[model samples]
Target: GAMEPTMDLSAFKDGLEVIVPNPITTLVPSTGYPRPTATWCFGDKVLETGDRVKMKTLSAYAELVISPSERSDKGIYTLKLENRVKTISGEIDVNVIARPSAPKELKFGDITKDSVHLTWEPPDDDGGSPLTGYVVEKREVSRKTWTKVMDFVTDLEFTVPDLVQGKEYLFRVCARNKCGPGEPAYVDEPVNMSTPATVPDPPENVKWRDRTANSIFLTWDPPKNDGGSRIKGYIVERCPRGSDKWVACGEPVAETKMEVTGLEEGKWYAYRVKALNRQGASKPSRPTEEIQAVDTQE
Candidate 1:
C-alpha cells in the first residue's frame, strides 16, 4: 500500500520545540501547497489527539497544546500524514536532558581517627528542572579510578567511616539531573587523612674489626636502648674502607659479633654495623674509621 514516508519541515533552525511544566509546546506546519494533516508521536508511540490534546487550525499552519509536563513524557517524536495513499513522516528529537549547570559545593565534616563526614549543596541554578540527586567520587593521590562511592544519595550528606587509619584519601562530588552527573567539582586538598605511630629512634653502637693477616674480626656494643623496641639482631657490613668500593664481610651477625678466617696473609679490611628491630633496619653505624692490616704479602 505505502512505499516509504516523505517528511518536510518549515525551517531547520526554528523547527525544534520544548515544553516546560507550565506546558508551552509549539507545532509548526510545513509550507506544502496542499498542507498535510499532522499526526503526532511522543517518543515513538502515536499520541491520540482526543481528550488530553487541544488543536488549533490556521489558514497555512497548525498548533497543539499539552497541558502539564512530566519527566517520562519526553523524547524523540515523529509526525506522520497521508496524501491520497502515500504517507509522509517528519522527525523531531525531543530530548529531556535533566539540566545544565556547574557542580555543587561539596563540604567535609568531622575527620575522625579513621573516618570523615561529607556533605554538599545544590547548584544555584539547576538549568530549569529541579535537582535530581548527587554522586560521590573518591581516589588516592594521582590515581585513576573515580570511585563512585554512592549513587541515588538522597540526603545532603554522607559519612565515610572506618577507613585505613594511617592512609590518606581524597573525595569529590557532582550533581545529577534527569540525564546524568554534571561536571566533577574536585576538592583542592584531599578530604581526609591520618598517620601511623611514630618511628622509634635508631639504635647506636655499631663497629667491627680484625687484627692478624688473613683473619678478620668484627664487634659492636649493644644499642643503648633498642630504639624503644626489642633489638631483633645486628647487621655487620664489612669491607676495606678508603678503597673505592667495599664488600659485606659475611652473613648478618645475630649475636652482635662476627669473625672471618682464611689464609691469605698481609691483607687489610674495614667494617660498619647497626641494630635491627621488627619495624625494619636502622641507620647504619658511622663508617668504622677505616683500618688495615696487610693480610697477604702477595
Candidate 2:
C-alpha cells in the first residue's frame, strides 16, 4: 500500500563521548532502513572486529568505539551502510589530537628582569585532533617534581618573570584539547637560568649619527674592558652641551644605540658612555663631541 520512504541520514561526530583517553566512541545514526549493517574504517582500511575495537548499537545509531587512539586514527573515517539495493557510504572526520605522543620542541626568548620568555610548537600528529591550549609547568631547580605554572594562552611564545637573582628554574609545556592536556611536553633538557646581575656601568664602541632636533642616533661595540664579566649593556647620559650637568636621556639604555629624542631644536647636546658587566660599570668613556640638531623643514 505504501511505496518505499526516503529517509535522511543522521550526522555523526567522533569523540562525542570520550569514556577514556585516546579511545573515543564513534556514533553513526541511520534512517530509511532498519537493522542496517554498519562497518567502520580508518582511511581506506577495513578493521576486523577484535580487541582494541568494540562495536555496539542503540535505537537507530551504531557506535564503533576504539580504545587508545593512536597516530593511525588521525585521518578520515568512513561508515559503510549496506542496504537491499546497493551500499551507501558516509564519512566523517575523526579529529583527535593528543599531546603525549607528540614530539615537542621548546624555545626561550625576550629575557627580562623578572621573567624569561618561552614557547613551543605542537606535535606532528597531535593525536589526530585540533589543539586548544597548552599547560606550562615550572619548579625551582632544587625541587623534585615540577609544579603547575599556569595554563598559558595559545601563542608562539611567552615570558616567565618575577624571579629572584641567582635562583634556578625548569619549565615544561604541553598541548591541550577540549578533554585536557595531551601527553606532557617538557624542555628536552631542563632550562636553568638566573636573575640578571646588578645593573652594570655604561657600554662601549661609542658612535653617533644623524642628528635631529629632538633625537640623535648612538651606537657602541660591547665594552672592551668589562671590569669583571663581559659587558652587560650601555647607558647614555645627556646634557646641554652648554651645561656641565647630565640628565638621563631615558631609562638606562640596554641596547647598543640610543635615539636621544624630545629635545629642543637647534640645541647642542653632549653624551657619554661607561662599560657595564655583571660585577659593575667601568669608568665612563670620554664624552663624544657635542652635536647640534636642526629641525626638519616638515
Candidate 3:
C-alpha cells in the first residue's frame, strides 16, 4: 500500500524569502512518503528549468531557483506534489523590489510666453509595487543648478509656469515608489518662450479697519496672481448702497490700506480694490459687506 504524501515547512517559518532586483532566489520544500513527484507553477503557467529558471528534485526534497529576479517575479508560487494514490501542495509568496525605473518620453506639449506644458510616460518597471507619484525638475540651459519644481504629482502631465520669456529652460522627470525616486529622464533640448503679459488677478479679503462720522478706513490683501509682472500699486473705490456708479477713493497707493474722508455722516458704503502692474490693472475685487460711518466715541 502507498502512503499519503506530506510536506514540512519548518525551515521557512519566519517568512518567505524577500529579494532585491537582479538577485538569485532559491526555495526548498521537504516531503515524505512514496517520494511524491513535484511541479512548480506561478498562477496559470507551469514553471520549468531554463535560462532564467532552474529546478532540482531528490527523494525527500525539491528546489526552485530564479536567477536575476525582476519586478514581475513577485507573486505566489505553488508546488504540487503527488503520490500513486494521494496528492498535496504548498505555496510560498515571493517579494522582489527595487527603485523604480526612470520616466520615459519626456516632451513639450504647449508653448506660451511665460511657461511651457510638459508630458511624459510612466516607468516600465515599478519595483514590484504601485507607483506613489512623480517628481518634476527644471534648470536653465547655461546653468548647472537643477531646481525641483514639484513632487508627488499623481498625473503624467504637468505645466511649468511663471518662467522668463526667451530664456532656454530644460526639464526632467523621475518616477517614485515605496523604494524611492529612480533615475531621471530629461528633455532633448531646451524650450524658449514668448507670450504677451496679461492682467493680474483681483485683490482679495476686502474689509474695513476704522470708521468715523465723516470718514472710513479700508484694508485688503494683494492679488493672488501677479500676471508675470511686478505689482506697482492698487486702486480703491467705493459707492453708496443704492448708487450704480462708484467713486475713486484717491490716487493709486503702494500701501494695502487707505482712508476716505468727506463722506456724508451715517451713510452705508460699499468698497472694493484692484491690483495694478506694468501690464494693466486687474478686475475689481468683490465688494465688502455694506457698512455705515458712525460717530461713536471710544
TM-score (all chains, Cα) for each model: 0.37, 0.47, 0.47
lDDT of 3: 0.82
Q: Give the TM-score of candidate 1.
A: 0.37
How many residue pairs clash per model?
11, 21, 1
RMSD of 1: 13.9
lDDT of 3 by residue, 1-298 (tens): 6677777755656645444545545456555567888899977789988887888888767888787777678788888889886778777777777888889899896787687899999899887778999999999888999999989899989998888876889899999888788899988877867434789999888888778878888888998789979899999998887787889987999988889888888788888898999999999999998778788786
Clashing pairs in 3: 113-195
RMSD of each: 13.9, 12.7, 10.8
So what's the TM-score on candidate 3?
Answer: 0.47
Candidate 2 lDDT for residue 211 = 74
Name the lDDT value of residue 51 in candidate 1.
55
Give the alpha carbon lDDT tens digit for every residue of 1-298 in model 1.
Answer: 3333344455535544343454536566544435456677776477776655666755455555665655455666666765455567766655333454555667776888777788777666564556678787777665777677787677778887656655667887777776556676676667546533222334355544455665667666776655446677776665653455645556666786777555244445556676777777676676666556554345
Query: Which whole-number lDDT from 0 to 100 does residue 230 have in model 1?
Result: 68
Question: 2 or 3, which is superior by lDDT?
Answer: 3
lDDT (Cα, 0-100) at 281 in candidate 3: 91
- Which stretches of candidate 1 lie above 4 Å from their native place? 1-100, 195-298
Best by lDDT: 3
> In terms of TM-score, how similar is model 2 to the real structure?
0.47
Please give the CA lDDT of all the candidate structures.
0.62, 0.66, 0.82
lDDT tens digits, residue span 48-111, model 2: 6788888885557767778876545556777776656556787666665444344367876565
